[PDB]
Amino acid sequence: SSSIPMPAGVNPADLAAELAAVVTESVDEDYLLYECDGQWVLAAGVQAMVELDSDELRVIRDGVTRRQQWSGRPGAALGEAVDRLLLETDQAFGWVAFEFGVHRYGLQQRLAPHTPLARVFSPRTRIMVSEKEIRLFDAGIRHREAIDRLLATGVREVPQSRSVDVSDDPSGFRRRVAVAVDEIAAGRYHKVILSRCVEVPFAIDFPLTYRLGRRHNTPVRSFLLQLGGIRALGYSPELVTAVRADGVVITEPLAGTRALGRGPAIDRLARDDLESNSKEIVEHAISVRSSLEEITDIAEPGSAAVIDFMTVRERGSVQHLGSTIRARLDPSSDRMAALEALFPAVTASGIPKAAGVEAIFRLDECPRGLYSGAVVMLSADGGLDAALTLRAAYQVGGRTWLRAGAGIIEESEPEREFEETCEKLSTLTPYLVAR
């Protein structure tokens, strides 16, 4: 409805991350900022919130809750609730937990009571931000003065970050990897993704940290949120599921990543390894095959295909190797069925998936929650965008932490894998802004 040209300097990411504080009608009002390749959407305030837990489904509106039992597949239950939410809003936002994908393997009985599966909400206001402009919608147009005020005074500057040590291994990651390798050697499964948490010994400013990190990470998707007691931010280069209004469904398993922008010789060496690494190539092939099979169960017959097989995508400080799998949703399926069909991401669980998920219940700190889960954006026209959450920071119940994993296979060395987790964490650890 209303628009404001984005000024000379003023980086969109910086303005978008600071918008919540000024449009937020009072308090620490919940919100979710979602970026889609340079296009930010801020969903500020909660009009209606849908909370799907392992044992209950709640709909909260203005402090009034509606509790009820749900049954069947979580995708069906969530889909029905979100479809009703979208009757009152053009877009809904939220996150889906790793645990959302365990029911399909008959492992939901292993979830403790009150395990969250999904949190989706209709916002009170939506603001879009791009390098070109700031767009306000409907009643949100009354935030024009506040936004103009912010641009007039300028956004808070970003202070220096505070370092954190990621070398300690309190959860025994190395030992857990040794256990997995043994199980794989025994033939119980081919691969499993195990992870470890790193506690941040000081409160961080999420909007500031998000902004600092966004100046060093340029993922196709990113997020910053404050929802139901959880603060989280992340940079997600992997799309676990995307459903378009026309029915096209896409998933993009990522094969591997290498640093970029360190000069010709170094960069080409890194790329050659990325495109020739037998280990990553084989695992990617297996992941692509897995995704094709999964998508085929919800697609129109003969519409599934692999587009851009093993292509390299350069994203500033890093370069990714991956593939895009595409299909057309079967007229008897739905976006939620598509999400659960590809959940949990094969790249963050294991192979066979059923065996991998089961191992994670035994060899990883559960519930994983947002980690290896997804942040989502749903549209009234049938659209769904789900970014896999891996490189992220969380704050819950007074605790702040990061989490990173590694794919474990028969030849994996616990020490090498521990080092891989350090490498991944390094995309966030140097940008933590305190307070």
Curated annotation (Swiss-Prot):
Q: Which InterPro entries match?
A: ADC_synthase, Anth_synth_I-like, Chorismate_C, Salicylate_synthase
SUBUNIT field: Monomer.
Please indicate if the UniProt record lists Nucleus as a keyword: no
Q: What induces it?
A: Induced by iron starvation conditions and during infection of human THP-1 macrophages. Transcriptionally repressed by IdeR and iron.
Name assigned to this protein: Salicylate synthase
Which pathway does this chain act in? Answer: Siderophore biosynthesis; mycobactin biosynthesis
Organism lineage:
Bacteria, Bacillati, Actinomycetota, Actinomycetes, Mycobacteriales
How is it regulated at the activity level? Answer: Inhibited by (E)-3-(1-carboxyprop-1-enyloxy)-2-hydroxybenzoic acid (AMT), 3-(1-carboxy-2-phenylvinyloxy)-2-hydroxybenzoic acid (phenyl-AMT), 3-(1-carboxy-3-methylbut-1-enyloxy)-2-hydroxybenzoic acid, 3-(1-carboxybut-1-enyloxy)-2-hydroxybenzoic acid (ethyl-AMT), 3-(1-carboxyprop-1-enyloxy)-2-hydroxybenzoic acid (methyl-AMT), 3-(1-carboxy-2-cyclopropylethenyloxy)-2-hydroxybenzoic acid (cyclopropyl-AMT) and 3-(1-carboxy-3-methylbut-1-enyloxy)-2-hydroxybenzoic acid (isopropyl-AMT).
Gene disruption phenotype: Cells lacking this gene display a reduction in salicylic acid biosynthesis and a drastic decrease in production of mycobactin compared with the wild-type strain.
